[PDB]
Amino acid sequence: DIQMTQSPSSLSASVGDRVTITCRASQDVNTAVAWYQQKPGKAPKLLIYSADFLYSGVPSRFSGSRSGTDFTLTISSLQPEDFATYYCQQHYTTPPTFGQGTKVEI
């Protein structure tokens, strides 16, 4: 039902750069948006829940923000190990739906 539109589909950046990824929901999802990091060969890992809460353990350079139906993930200072695909997801209603993913290359 709820479509999550992620942009961009991929980007390239250098170690130390700030990067921002945007996610737009097709309907109200309140605060309930999560962000996952998936490194090649690895399981997705939760970074952010409820738009802006940092999952315990996750580096503080990762932050989430929300303006209405618009959601952003920012990595404030890209590290070598942050090369991954990032996904947004609404956890408001069933089914939980994911963005198409944004591949971040260094």
Partner 1 sequence: EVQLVESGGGLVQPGGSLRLSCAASGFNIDDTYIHWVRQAPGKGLEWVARIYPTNGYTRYADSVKGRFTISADTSKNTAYLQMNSLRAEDTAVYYCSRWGGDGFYAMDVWGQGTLVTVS
Residues that bind partner 1 (CB under 8 A): 32, 34, 36, 38, 43-46, 49-50, 55, 85, 87, 89, 91, 94-101
Q: Among residues 62 and 87, whose Cβ is nearest to partner 1?
A: 87
Taking the complex as a whole, the smallest distance from the CB of residue 15 to partner 1 amounts, in Å, to: 26
Taking the complex as a whole, the smallest distance from the CB of residue 104 to partner 1 amounts, in Å, to: 14
Residue in 30, 82, 39 with CA at minimum distance from that of residue 73:
82
Q: How far is CA 72 from CA 9, 17, 34, 41, in A?
A: 14, 16, 10, 25
What distance in Å separates the CA atoms of residue 96 and residue 74, rounded to the nearest whole number?
22
Taking the complex as a whole, the smallest distance from the CB of residue 97 to partner 1 amounts, in Å, to: 7
Q: Among residues 17 and 52, whose Cβ is nearest to partner 1?
A: 52
What distance in Å separates the CA atoms of residue 53 and residue 85, rounded to the nearest whole number?
20
Q: Among residues 69 and 103, whose Cβ is nearest to partner 1?
A: 103
